[PDB]
Amino acid sequence: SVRIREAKEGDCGDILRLIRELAEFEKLKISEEALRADGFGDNPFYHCLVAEILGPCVVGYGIYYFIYSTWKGRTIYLEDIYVMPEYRGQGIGSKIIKKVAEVALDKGCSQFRLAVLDWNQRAMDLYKALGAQDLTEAEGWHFFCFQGEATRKLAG
Amino acid sequence: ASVRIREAKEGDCGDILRLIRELAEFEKLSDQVKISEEALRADGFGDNPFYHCLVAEICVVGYGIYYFIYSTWKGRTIYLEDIYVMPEYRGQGIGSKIIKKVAEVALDKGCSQFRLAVLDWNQRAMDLYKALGAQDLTEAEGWHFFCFQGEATRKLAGK
Numbered sequence: 001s002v003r004i005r006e007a008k009e010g011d012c013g014d015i016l017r018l019i020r021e022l023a024e025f026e027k028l029k030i031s032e033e034a035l036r037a038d039g040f041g042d043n044p045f046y047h048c049l050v051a052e053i054l055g056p057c058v059v060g061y062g063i064y065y066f067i068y069s070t071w072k073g074r075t076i077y078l079e080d081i082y083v084m085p086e087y088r089g090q091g092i093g094s095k096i097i098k099k100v101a102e103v104a105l106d107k108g109c110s111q112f113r114l115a116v117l118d119w120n121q122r123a124m125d126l127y128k129a130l131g132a133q134d135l136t137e138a139e140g141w142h143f144f145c146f147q148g149e150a151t152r153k154l155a156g
Numbered sequence: 157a158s159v160r161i162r163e164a165k166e167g168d169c170g171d172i173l174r175l176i177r178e179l180a181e182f183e184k185l186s187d188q189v190k191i192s193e194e195a196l197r198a199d200g201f202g203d204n205p206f207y208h209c210l211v212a213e214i215c216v217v218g219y220g221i222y223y224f225i226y227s228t229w230k231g232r233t234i235y236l237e238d239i240y241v242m243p244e245y246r247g248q249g250i251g252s253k254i255i256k257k258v259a260e261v262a263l264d265k266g267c268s269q270f271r272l273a274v275l276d277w278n279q280r281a282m283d284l285y286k287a288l289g290a291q292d293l294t295e296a297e298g299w300h301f302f303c304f305q306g307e308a309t310r311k312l313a314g315k
């Protein structure tokens with residue numbers, strides 16, 4: 001059986017290995033020391049769940065953080081989304097999504113956001129199934145980003 | 157017009173919400189306004205705020221609302237979530253002046269990663285931000301802004 005639970009400092013080794021998996025999947029910094037140094041400390045800027053089979057081992061993760069929307073109020077942003085290849089399509093990806101849903105309400109967040117890769121069609125179809133809205137296509141939102149000098153200039 | 161940009165104080169929440177409502181009312185999307193004045197005060201003027209707000213004051217006629225994130229591609233980052241300037245003050249460069257400050261906040265914090273989203277109709281801001289060093293993300297990388305709103309949320313939580 002599988003259980004989606006909040007992560008503990010003890011899972012930071014597995015989480016680091018899963019961060020290097022998902023990104024390799026998405027194609028393009030944070031050592032274990034970094035994970036504990038912020039993800040738990042006392043002033044966490046981000047938290048997460050660790051899909052764990054019950055020998056008991058970490059088989060995927062979901063990390064999120066609290067952001068803000070001017071239409072509803074307390075929002076939740078679900079960043080990284082990844083399940084081990086052998087363990088996909090068997091309900092785990094959704095259980096992580098549902099858990100993020102529970103945390104949202106429990107924390108006064110009625111809605112939740114996230115970004116998605118265009119070629120990553122399967123996931124998009126997953127999110128749409130569970131009720132998500134592709135605001136990029138349903139409204140026209142175009143993510144935009146500055147890096148280094150670009151931000152320096154923007155700042156005037 | 158004689159205007160200054162400044163950090164919002166809990167007392168600016170009434171004007172911030174009034175402005176948010178004026179916008180939504182303009183787009184005929186009022187019914188989508190679920191935020192509250194009490195939430196604006198609490199969600200950012202207590203323990204650990206969900207957002208930060210800069211207001212353009214002459215009478216508050218505009219605002220900028222941001223906060224930081226924690227993705228996984230480049231680490232911490234400042235993110236602009238919304239900017240509004242009353243119609244009577246458009247063309248004055250206030251919104252342009254507000255964004256510059258949000259960028260200065262990031263740099264002042266030691267962060268050079270600045271993110272945001274742009275509306276599809278905007279044909280100047282985009283090509284402009286590019287001439288600055290930025291790059292649209294949805295037209296290129298294929299990044300799509302997905303949103304699980306209220307109906308889907310509760311349903312997922314089990315309700």
Ligand SMILES: CC(=O)SCCNC(=O)CCNC(=O)[C@H](O)C(C)(C)COP(=O)(O)OP(=O)(O)OC[C@H]1O[C@@H](n2cnc3c(N)ncnc32)[C@H](O)[C@@H]1OP(=O)(O)O
Nearest residue numbers: 079080081082083088089090091092093094114122123126
């Ligand atoms: C915000 C983001 O971070 S988006 C990044 C998402 N991550 C990735 O693409 C990395 C590689 N893939 C994965 O990690 C997983 O395949 C996930 C997270 C996308 C989906 O988790 P899964 O456990 O495979 O999906 P789960 O079984 O819970 O499926 C729920 C729905 O998604 C669909 N789905 C999405 N991806 C897959 C997949 N790779 N294999 C099988 N089904 C998939 C299912 O068919 C199901 O849809 P349906 O009800 O219409 O049939």
